Structures are given as C-alpha cells and as structure tokens.
Design a protein around this ligand. Structure first.
Ligand SMILES: Nc1ncnc2c1ncn2[C@@H]1O[C@H](COP(=O)(O)OP(=O)(O)NP(=O)(O)O)[C@@H](O)[C@H]1O
Ligand SMILES: [Mg+2]
Length: 284
C-alpha cells in the first residue's frame, strides 16, 4: 500500500475507464488515452508498476503544469488521471515551422519560466525539462507534463545511446552529477529558447559523447538573426558555471526582469489573458 497523498481516490478502478490508445511511453510509466465510462470525458492516464518502486507524489497546481484529477492503485499498478493535452508537442510545431519568431518564442519561454519560478518558490526544482515534456493545450498555452511524481524513488533504465540519443538538455553540473538545484532549470530554459530560435539544441551532435564534450568544453556560439536582448538572455542562461548563470542570485526575478521579457505582463500571462500567438487546430 503506497501513500499517494491528497489526490488518492479509494474507490477508483481500472474498470472505470475505456483505454483507447497509447499516447506515449515514459521512463516512469506508459501514458494512455482513456475515456471515463460514466462521465463521458477523455483523460490521459499514466500507469506505473508497483514493482518499479524501490511521499511518492507531491502534486503542484499551476496554469502551465498539467492538471492531476485523482490517483488510484491496484495490487500491481498505480494510476494517475491527468488532463489530456491535445494541442501537440511544442517541438512538433517547431519542427513543422523550422523556427519561431522572437515574439512567439518569448511567449512560450515566458510561460515555462513562470511555472519554473513558481516551483522554486515552493522549494521544488523541475530538474529534467526535455522537449517531450513541453506540450501545447488546445488553446496554444504551454503545459508541462510533470505532475509531481518522486522520481528519485522509482527504478528505470537511464541508458544513453552512442548516436542519436533521446533529446534532453543536460547542464554542465548534471553531467558532473552534482546535486540538482534550481539553476539547472534556468539552463534548460536557455536551451529550449535556443532551439526555438535556431532549430537545434545548443551544442548538438549526432554523436552523444561529442555533444557532452561540447556542453562542457565548447564556448557558446550564437549565430546572427536574433536580437541583442535575445543574445544577452541566452548568454546568461547558458553560462556553464551555475554560480554565474542568470537566476543564480535572485532566481526567477532575474529572468522576469530581463530585457528580453520586458513586453511580458507576467500577471496577464499567468492569468491566461494573453491570447496565444498560435492556435492549434484542435478543440477537446
Ligand atoms: N497529460 C498528457 N497529455 C498528453 N500527452 C501526455 C500527457 N502526459 C504525458 N504525455 C506524453 O506522454 C509521453 C510520456 O510522458 P513523460 O512525461 O515524458 O513520461 P516519463 O518519461 O515517465 N516522465 P519524464 O522522466 O519527466 O519524461 C510524452 O511524450 C508526453 O508528451
Ligand atoms: Mg519521458
């Protein structure tokens, strides 16, 4: 019997749902598209085996973090019932469009930044923001896929492939296996912004070992066709020494106040009053 916290529902069974298709496979459990038999609504359901576990859940509500509706368990499995986010992976749109213009990139970067700053205020670090974790909902707002699962208590294969490794943004300090602190999130934000503007992750190589070598040892080169403010922001977020990285002293306040983000009304942003730059052609 596992303590799932306030989201726990002692009455729910897998039999409650019509599982339709597999949305995706994750290190910590498969995500399925499921319909609630009775309610007639669609959810994303994450399913994790209990044998995989060596508070396991601390869910946080925020406009740009995926909503957790409830959680339940069987003799063998744990089920987490989530908002089904159907606007597509942000980097699916990026790939389709080659790159984003700065106002578009700024919007997405700001929404992610707000969620990260909020988490840090609650002494929570995101730790592993990857492209696959960044979705758009049907309206075109950012939704991050982590919902508070305590990963450092669940077993998984973190094997890396020699060529063409799963996309992720490893900060120099993560490669050094140093304790995760909040500034890893700011490196990840920088990498996401870089990729939105330039079309590839910073330091990229087909050869994963080369890419790690680049992250650690290759100076940041920022190609032309971005503004001075964007350049200065990326220079700050992609500082290799976390003690010199933008956000090291005053966290989110340093990002919030950066000139790249001057045009963002953070209050309007977090209250979803800024109509998104792009509307995905979906509604459900
Ligand atoms: N609520 C959701 N709605 C739609 N797609 C989702 C949802 N949650 C996750 N996905 C997709 O399902 C896949 C697996 O989820 P993900 O959060 O990557 O799982 P994980 O590997 O167990 N956790 P992490 O270690 O943070 O990646 C990803 O491609 C997500 O984009
Ligand atoms: Mg994953």
């Amino acid at each position: 019997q596992i303590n799932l916290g306030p989201s726990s529902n002692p009455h729910a069974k897998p039999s409650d749902f019509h599982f339709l298709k597999v949305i995706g496979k994750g290190s910590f459990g498969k995500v399925l598209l499921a319909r609630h038999k009775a309610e007639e609504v669609f959810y994303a359901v994450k399913v994790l085996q209990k044998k995989a576990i060596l508070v396991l859940l601390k869910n946080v509500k925020h406009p740009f973090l995926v909503g957790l509706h409830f959680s339940f368990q069987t003799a063998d499995k744990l089920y987490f019932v989530l908002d089904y986010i159907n606007g597509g992976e942000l980097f699916y749109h990026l790939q389709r469009e080659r790159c984003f213009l700065e106002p578009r990139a700024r919007f997405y970067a700001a929404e992610i930044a707000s969620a990260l700053g909020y988490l840090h205020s609650l002494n929570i670090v995101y730790r592993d923001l990857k492209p696959e974790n960044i979705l758009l909902d049907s309206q075109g707002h950012i939704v991050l896929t982590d919902f508070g699962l305590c990963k450092e208590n669940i077993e998984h294969n973190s094997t890396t492939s020699t060529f063409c490794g799963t996309p992720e943004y490893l900060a120099p300090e993560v490669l050094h296996k140093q304790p995760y602190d909040r500034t890893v999130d700011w490196w990840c934000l920088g990498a996401v912004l870089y990729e939105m503007l330039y079309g590839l992750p910073p330091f990229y190589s087909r050869n994963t070992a080369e890419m790690y070598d680049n992250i650690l040892n290759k100076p940041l080169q920022l190609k032309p066709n971005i503004t001075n403010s964007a350049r200065h922001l990326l220079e700050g977020l992609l500082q290799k020494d976390r003690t010199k990285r933008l956000g090291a002293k005053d966290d989110f306040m340093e990002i919030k106040s950066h000139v790249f983000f001057s045009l963002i009304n953070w209050d309007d942003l977090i209250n979803k009053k800024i109509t998104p730059p792009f509307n995905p052609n979906v509604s459900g």
